[PDB]
Amino acid sequence: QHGKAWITLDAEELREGAVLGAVMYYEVKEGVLASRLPLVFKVRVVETG
Amino acid sequence: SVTSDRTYYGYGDVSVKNEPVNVVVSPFSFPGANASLSSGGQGVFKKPD
Numbered sequence A: 001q002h003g004k005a006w007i008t009l010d011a012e013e014l015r016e017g018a019v020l021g022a023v024m025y026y027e028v029k030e031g032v033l034a035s036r037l038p039l040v041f042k043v044r045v046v047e048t049g
Numbered sequence B: 001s002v003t004s005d006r007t008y009y010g011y012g013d014v015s016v017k018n019e020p021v022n023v024v025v026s027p028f029s030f031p032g033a034n035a036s037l038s039s040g041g042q043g044v045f046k047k048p049d
Ligand SMILES: [Ca+2]
Pocket: A047, A048, A049
């Protein structure tokens, strides 16, 4: 449902490398059988300084 | 893609062949041999088997 995020980063965090891991909570619909499904995320740099 | 029709099967068979009982008969010939029955006579005859 909610598909947009706004992660922002400060000068203390950028000083050591910002690694963005991912945690996923899921439940495959009843009976569906698939192979190599893609999920593609758009990363946009909106503002910087 | 594939929406599995979730339906598996188990099966079995039962074999009812025979009837419960066998009535083996040895018929009787009651005046028999080495004995005699007369008209109007009275008595007892017995076959054990
Ligand atoms: Ca700027």
